[PDB]
């Protein structure tokens, strides 16, 4: 069906999604929900229109719920806030650490910056 | 806000490799590329915030995925209207259309169906 085609359009995007920062840094429950929806759709692509439609909806909703990007932005702001509240750091150190946080490509990089700032401050 | 802008610029290469970009209308691909370039140039709060909006709006506007689903349906419709094809041929061609990973693959299926039908 047109629904089968649409479902395929979602499952075939699996691998690029799974390699994206927005997936990789999403909350674990949300990563699991996307994986489970993709597996369920793959089962079908090997139905009733309602079953295909529910599978499609479940993939789209899981995919849209991935929040790696927002997690990264939140991690950056947390690092910045820490760097700003680090009263013992001089301006040069704060600037360098801010540059690291703002440039963080992964949540772990921003978290490492926060930890390093706090360590240096003490 | 500089941090948030950086998050959008740094995603440029993965976006550019996605089918949703590659098969987007050319004006929408251009719009995303221009917005990313404008943001890169920056890397006033309101100028940073507008740059960010512009990247996010351009990214959201990319429509490769919808172009692919459209191309799939157009191929299916052609296959369905191809009165000289038998059930076996129609089925095989529908499988190819539904499995198309890029717009061009679905358009090739449509052309092939029409050619086979005539
Ligand atoms: Cl991403
Ligand atoms: Cl895509
Ligand atoms: Cl695809
Ligand atoms: Cl054609
Ligand atoms: Na999301
Ligand atoms: Na879009
Ligand atoms: Zn992304
Ligand atoms: Zn979405
Ligand atoms: Zn002190
Ligand atoms: Zn670490
Ligand atoms: Zn720590
Ligand atoms: Zn330590
Ligand atoms: Zn220590
Ligand atoms: Zn990405
Ligand atoms: Zn993709
Ligand atoms: Zn995609
Ligand atoms: Zn268009
Ligand atoms: Zn504003
Ligand atoms: Zn969006
Ligand atoms: Zn099928
Ligand atoms: Zn072609
Ligand atoms: Zn043709
Ligand atoms: Zn031909
Ligand atoms: Zn011919």
The whole-angstrom distance between residue A16's C-alpha and the CA centroid of its chain comes to 13
Structure tokens that stand for A69 in this block:
């990007």
Contacts of A12 in chain B (CB under 8 A): 99, 101
Calpha distance A10→A38 (Å, rounded): 8
Residue A85 φ/ψ, nearest 5 degrees: -85, 5
A74 and chain B in contact, CB less than 8 A: no
Listed by start position, the domains of chain A span 1-67, 68-122
Rounded to whole angstroms, the Cα distance separating B30 from A27 reads 33
How many A from CA of A116 to the centre of ligand 1?
26
Residue matched to tokens 């700032």? A117
Compute the distance between CA of residue B79 and CA of residue B110 in angstroms, rounded to an integer. 7
Residue of A nearest to B106 (CA): A5
Contacts of B15 (CB under 8 A, 6+ apart): B21, B32, B59, B62
Q: What is the resolution of this structure in A?
A: 2.0
The CA distance from B118 to B111, in Å, is 11
Judge: B7–A101 Cβ closer than 8 Å, yes or no: no
CATH, domain range A68-122: 1.20.5.420
Considering the segment(s) B1-63 as one domain, its CATH architecture is Up-down Bundle (1.20)
Using the mean position of ligand 5's atoms as its centre, give its distance from the Cα of residue A44 in Å: 25
For residue B6, CA distances in Å to A20, A37, A43 come to 16, 31, 39
CA–CA gap between residue B95 and residue A2 (Å, rounded) = 11
Please indicate whether, in this complex, the C-beta atoms of B14 and A21 are within 8 angstroms of each other.
yes
What does the alpha-carbon distance between residue A63 and residue B86 come to, in Å, rounded to a whole number? 38
CA–CA distance, A109 with B98 (Å, rounded to integer): 40
Beta-carbon contacts of residue A42 (< 8 Å; ≥ 6 apart): A11
Chain A residues within an 8 Å CB radius of B101: 12
Domain A1-67, CATH number (from 1.10.3720.10, 4.10.520.10, 1.20.5.420, 3.40.50.800): 1.20.5.420
Pick the CATH number of B64-118 from 3.90.190.20, 1.20.5.420, 3.20.20.70, 1.10.357.10: 1.20.5.420
Count of CA atoms in the C-beta half-sphere (13 A) of A15: 4
Residue in B6, B97, B101 closest to A12 by CB: B101
C-alpha–C-alpha distance, residues A59 and A53, integer Å: 10
Q: How far is CA B43 from CA A102, B15, B37, B52, in A?
A: 10, 19, 10, 11
Instruction: Give me B4's structure tokens.
Output: 């948030």
């Amino acid at each position: 069906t047109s629904t089968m085609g649409n479902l395929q359009t979602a499952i075939n995007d699996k691998s690029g999604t799974l390699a994206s920062q927005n997936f990789l840094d999403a909350d674990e429950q949300k990563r699991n929900a996307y994986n489970q929806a993709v597996s369920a759709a793959e089962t079908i692509l090997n139905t009733a229109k309602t079953a295909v439609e529910q599978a499609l909806n479940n993939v789209n909703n899981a995919k849209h719920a991935l929040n790696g990007t927002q997690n990264l932005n939140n991690a950056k702001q947390a690092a910045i806030t820490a760097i700003n509240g680090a009263s013992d750091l001089n301006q040069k150190q704060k600037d360098a650490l801010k540059a690291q946080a703002n440039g963080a490509q992964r949540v772990s990089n921003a978290q490492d910056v926060q930890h390093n700032a706090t360590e240096l401050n003490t």
